[PDB]
A and B are shown apart, each in its own frame.
Chain A
């Protein structure tokens, strides 16, 4: 019932040139940019990945990013979002993803990254995001995704990690943040991504979860993150990637979703917004373009549904987890 109505003058064409220009110029000054410094490393990851999916990575500042990443690794091995900020699993993952895109993993101390991740695992198998102990399946995914990309999954207690994640599975086939938490598409992506990396997709009820996920698609064509909420273009990533991992991507109406995603583009400034008529940002630009790649858009490089990075990059590092289909 809650849904957007798409306007008939909404963009129906893919504006790659505009999106590459938008991202290439992003952070050239600035209120939102300054207020969001707490996520800068992930912000850099979103921009670089989307530019690489569009074949435009060369227009970004490699040498400058490598120096920034090195300066963000703390003595404990963890990486912070920006200089002076505190280390966290989220930004550790984003940094390792960036270094993987640039084939420059040697830039940071890998042994110490591994030690940091290892240290955040709890007795029940969960992961805290940092030393202050917040537990979230988001962090389980960050820990194994980081380690997989480094070739070091054997460094953690994998069976306990699996047990914790499966304890977060709900009556509807989905997953939440922690045991007892309500299902949400974002957590579902993290947990199905976790289970792909650790080779446990046979423990997912793909038909039940797949149904719950395809019921995210509203009459507008756009996807929400859970029942009775508004569509948001970043669910084109969270929901579709999960469906792809569990082999049920065809349970979505591809053409209606594609039209919704294209309608979220700003024809003037470039970039994508969460919904038509809202303000654009790099986060929704990545996830809109990544969502289109998953739907088979020819102008965009194929994207790994697990790691949200071009598949050609993961082929290069030989880490491509088997999906259900």
Chain B
């Protein structure tokens, strides 16, 4: 268990919750061994799964009941049970939106239906992502729904844009963009025009909020996702040099910002390792003073880059 702060009637209330939970659990298992796959099981498990959605066996019992009732109920009665189940799932998700069991039961349920309302499931996603934009369960469910409904990469890309601009907490939405972009193109590395548009979007982000670590992580990826030094186009070379000078300006505004310093080093690598060897080494020293916890990593990176440089000088 996570997040339980340490600090009679509080002790008593849960003493009474337990005996109810225990008797309800007792009752469920008795019915199950008796082969009573009926509505009373759904009533009993609803009482338990509300507070304790990680009790996986009880989700399995709900599924066994639903399967069994479907064979011996009418189509209209079966439909009614399904809608009741969706209501129950939504109320469970309101209480605990980060349980594997609940999200999976919803997928199981939706995967059985002809015909599910996927537009509505996508809206449910957007609501939960408004509450917590990093809920990976919800992003996973959205990817499941999008595939089911065959929503196109372009639509999902448009969704990620609004999310990134309306506020921070963007790591999950940048991650989604990194999977969407290669699909839009794709290949058996991003095309330069795409790459240049993304760089513009990401540099907006980390100048708008320089503490936003997600934009810096995504930017490091973009830097490696191109056709390479040195088939640097005139436009890419100009863009990167421009990014270099904007990072130095930001370094002036935010002198304890480690991300800007690391990015300068990476840009110089992307531009011309040997021409910038002196400056690269100066930046490593500044960076280690600013981010001492990463000193071992930074020394190893610098060692890698120094080897690269020796290899470049020897190809003369």
B-contacting residues of A (Cβ < 8 Å)? 1, 31-32, 34-36, 38-39, 80, 84-86, 88, 130, 132-134, 136, 170-172, 176-178, 180-184, 207, 210-212, 214-215, 217, 219, 226-229, 232, 248, 250-253, 256, 266, 273-274, 277-279, 281, 283
Contact = CB atoms under 8 A, between A and B. Distances in A.
B56 A35 contact: no
Given A31-B14, A277-B6, A132 B104 contact: yes
Contacts of A219: 293
A177 B293 contact: no
Contacts of A251: 294, 296-297, 300
Contacts of B139: 181-182
Nearest to A212: B217
Contact of A182 (B3, B60, B171): B171
Given A251-B297, A253-B293, A183 B175 contact: yes
Given A35-B52, A86-B57, 13 more contacts: A38-B52, A85-B56, A88-B56, A171-B179, A171-B221, A172-B217, A183-B175, A212-B217, A219-B293, A228-B213, A278-B4, A279-B6, A283-B1
B143 interface: yes
A85 B57 contact: yes
Interface majority SS (helix, strand, loop, mixed), chain B: helix
B203 interface: no
B246 interface: no
Given A38-B56, A134-B104, A32 B294 contact: no
B272 interface: no
Contacts of B218: 171
27 contacts: A31-B14, A31-B15, A32-B1, A35-B18, A35-B52, A36-B1, A86-B60, A132-B60, A136-B100, A170-B179, A171-B178, A171-B221, A182-B171, A219-B293, A227-B213, A227-B214, A228-B213, A248-B297, A251-B294, A253-B293, A256-B293, A274-B2, A277-B5, A277-B6, A278-B5, A279-B1, A279-B6
A37 B276 CA distance: 61
Nearest to B171: A227
B61 to A, nearest CB: 9
Interface centre among A136, A227, A253 (most CB of B within 10 A): A227
A231 B108 CA distance: 33
A130 B104 CA distance: 12
A146 B300 CA distance: 36
Given A251-B300, A279-B5, A182 B56 contact: no
B254 interface: no
Given A132-B108, A227-B214, A217 B5 contact: no
Contacts, number: 123
Interface string B1-13: 1111110000000
B52 A177 contact: no
A67 B306 CA distance: 60
B39 to A, nearest CB: 21
A171 B175 contact: yes
B3 A278 contact: yes
B104 A226 contact: no
Nearest to A32: B1
Nearest to B212: A228
Contacts of A171: 175, 178-179, 218, 221
A9 to B, nearest CB: 15
Contacts of A281: 1
Contact of A250 (B52, B172, B178, B296): B296
A219 B18 CA distance: 41
Interface centre among B14, B15, B56, B143 (most CB of A within 10 A): B56
Contacts of A132: 59-60, 63, 104, 108
A38 B140 contact: no
A279 B4 contact: yes
A228 B169 contact: yes
A73 B55 CA distance: 18
B295 to A, nearest CB: 8
Interface in B132-185: 134, 136, 139-140, 143, 169, 171-172, 175-176, 178-179
